[PDB]
């Protein structure tokens, strides 16, 4: 479809313009916030998509084109060079085959091969429709993640405070147990003394009566 560098940028800006023109009804818009660099030179294609560094999947050239849409979603189309080998170089026809929406492969429905031909309007409308369908859940996911963060932080703080409060109760119990043992020992000693003294008293009382029987040996 396109050259590596001599046709990629123009086709991408035209594609972005078509998407923007036909995505008018939905609040979603497509574009890039990137504006070149610090140097401010004229003849600048500010609006459009972005191109990433080439990679190699299984020995074949791989060249990405990322279209960052509003609302937090993205659309990425992928090129490869069958006519040229080794590096991508320049001035080399490229083939658009893979279409990705939010990292999930979706080429399977957007681009069946049918009648040995295909138009672009179907592609554009199809991607617009899937983007506007997916946006709802893609948006609720972030809210649920933030809620998870807030709740886990609160709960963990609760647990730490409660444990810090808990700490010293075992030592309190230990001191109590020591005092209890001391009390038990005291009670036992007193009871033993008392019973021994009772036995002594009974023996002495018997002797007293026995001796008073005769009157102290006359």
């Amino acid at each position: 479809i396109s050259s590596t560098r001599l046709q990629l940028h123009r086709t991408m800006q035209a594609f972005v313009r078509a998407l923007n023109q036909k995505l008018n009804g939905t609040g979603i818009s497509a574009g890039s916030d990137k504006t070149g660099d610090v140097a401010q030179s004229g003849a600048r294609a500010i609006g459009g998509a972005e191109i990433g560094r080439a990679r190699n999947v299984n020995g074949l050239p791989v060249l990405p084109a990322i279209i960052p849409l509003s609302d937090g979603q993205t659309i990425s189309i992928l090129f490869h060079s069958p006519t040229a080998e080794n590096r991508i170089t320049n001035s080399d026809t490229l083939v658009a085959f893979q279409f990705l929406l939010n990292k999930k492969d979706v080429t399977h429905t957007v681009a069946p091969m049918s009648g040995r031909d295909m138009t672009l309007a179907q592609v554009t409308m199809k991607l617009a429709n899937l983007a506007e369908k997916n946006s709802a859940k893609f948006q609720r996911a972030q809210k649920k993640k933030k809620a998870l963060v807030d709740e886990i932080t609160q709960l963990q703080a609760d647990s730490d405070q409660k444990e810090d409060a808990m700490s010293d109760l075992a030592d309190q119990v230990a001191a109590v147990e020591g005092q209890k043992a001391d009390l038990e020992q005291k009670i036992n000693a007193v009871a033993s003394e008392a019973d021994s003294l009772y036995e002594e008293n009974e023996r002495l009382q018997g002797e007293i009566d026995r001796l008073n029987r005769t009157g102290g040996r006359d």
Binding site: K145, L148, V149, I152, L155, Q156, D158, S159, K162, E163, A165, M166, L169, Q172, V173, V176, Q179, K180, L183, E184, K186, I187, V190, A191, E193, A194, L197, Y198, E200, N201, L204, Q205, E207, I208, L211, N212, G216, R217, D218
Partner: protein, 69 residues
């Protein structure tokens, strides 16, 4: 995953609250029982006091009796 974090947080939470309740009741309990022990000790000391007084009186009366044959 945050889901395992939910699991661990809630299980530790339940564990800690159960421990907190039991450990909060323990102190009232042990105060009660130490007071009871003090009471038992005092009762036993009273009985011992009585026995000692009786022993002393009885021994004195004996020594009075046997003197001088």
């Amino acid at each position: 995953s945050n889901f395992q974090r939910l699991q661990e947080a809630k299980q530790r939470n339940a564990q800690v609250v159960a421990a907190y309740k039991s450990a909060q009741n323990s102190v009232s309990f042990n105060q009660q029982q130490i007071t009871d022990l003090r009471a038992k000790l005092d009762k036993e000391t009273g009985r011992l006091n009585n026995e000692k007084a009786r022993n002393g009186e009885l021994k004195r009366r004996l020594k009075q009796l046997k003197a001088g044959n």
